Amino acid sequence: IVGGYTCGANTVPYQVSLNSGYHFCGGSLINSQWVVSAAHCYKSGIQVRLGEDNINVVEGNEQFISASKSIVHPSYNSNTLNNDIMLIKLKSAASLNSRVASISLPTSCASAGTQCLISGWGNTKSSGTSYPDVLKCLKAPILSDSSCKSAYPGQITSNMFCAGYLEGGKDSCQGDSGGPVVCSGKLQGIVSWGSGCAQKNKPGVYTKVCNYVSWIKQTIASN
Ligand SMILES: N=C(N)c1ccc(/C=N/OCC(=O)O)cc1
Numbered sequence: 591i592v593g594g595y596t597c598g599a600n601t602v603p604y605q606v607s608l609n610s611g612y613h614f615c616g617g618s619l620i621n622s623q624w625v626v627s628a629a630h631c632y633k634s635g636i637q638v639r640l641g642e643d644n645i646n647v648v649e650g651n652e653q654f655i656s657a658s659k660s661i662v663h664p665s666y667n668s669n670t671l672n673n674d675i676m677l678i679k680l681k682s683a684a685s686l687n688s689r690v691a692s693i694s695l696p697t698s699c700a701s702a703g704t705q706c707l708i709s710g711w712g713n714t715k716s717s718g719t720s721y722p723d724v725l726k727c728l729k730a731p732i733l734s735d736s737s738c739k740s741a742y743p744g745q746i747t748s749n750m751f752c753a754g755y756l757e758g759g760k761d762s763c764q765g766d767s768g769g770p771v772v773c774s775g776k777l778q779g780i781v782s783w784g785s786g787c788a789q790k791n792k793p794g795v796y797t798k799v800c801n802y803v804s805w806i807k808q809t810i811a812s813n
């Protein structure tokens with residue numbers, strides 16, 4: 591997260607870190623057994639880390655649970671990043687409490703102008719590289735589809751939206767991938783892609799979760 595703020599320990603209780611010996615992606619806990627992330631975060635041997643603030647220090651509220659299975663969206667295209675969404679099932683159910691909590695799926699899509707909270711342990715620099723150890727947060731508006739398409743000609747599908755600031759300076763970044771965009775207590779987006787980070791006229795692009803609710807529910811119901 592570039593140009594954000596320190597969230598505060600366990601203030602974003604649905605935020606997970608995906609770990610394969612090291613943090614590599616974010617995710618969002620959607621019930622005691624399931625995490626939503628980006629398909630481009632797919633790999634084998636994932637351990638889901640819940641209740642994290644400092645990802646490098648055991649602070650007392652963590653739950654580390656290995657993934658039993660991952661399900662990449664059936665129509666995920668890694669070239670275009672269309673349908674950049676994946677479900678991860680935990681080998682055992684997380685213990686839910688104030689600091690480890692699921693986030694609601696949307697019942698309707700959010701609109702341009704809605705303010706959302708974007709979070710992660712990604713790069714905090716728009717030119718250099720600096721990885722924070724504690725969770726970072728950014729409040730950002732969803733942008734209009736027209737401005738999103740104008741920013742990224744020929745690249746924005748109906749399964750994507752832009753959020754952030756056309757002026758630059760405030761954005762998600764590398765390492766935030768798969769993490770949440772939450773708007774009025776609903777998971778509306780997943781950190782997917784963008785040109786660099788926090789660049790002028792290059793806002794963050796996010797997987798449009800409201801498109802996938804049917805698939806998420808049906809998948810969970812049978813796996
Ligand atoms: N909002 C952005 N500008 C943005 C967001 C996410 C990415 C994803 N990079 O994938 C590599 C990785 O996470 O390891 C790029 C740009």
Ligand SMILES: [Ca+2]
Pocket residue numbers: 642643644645646647648649652
């Ligand atoms: Ca920790």
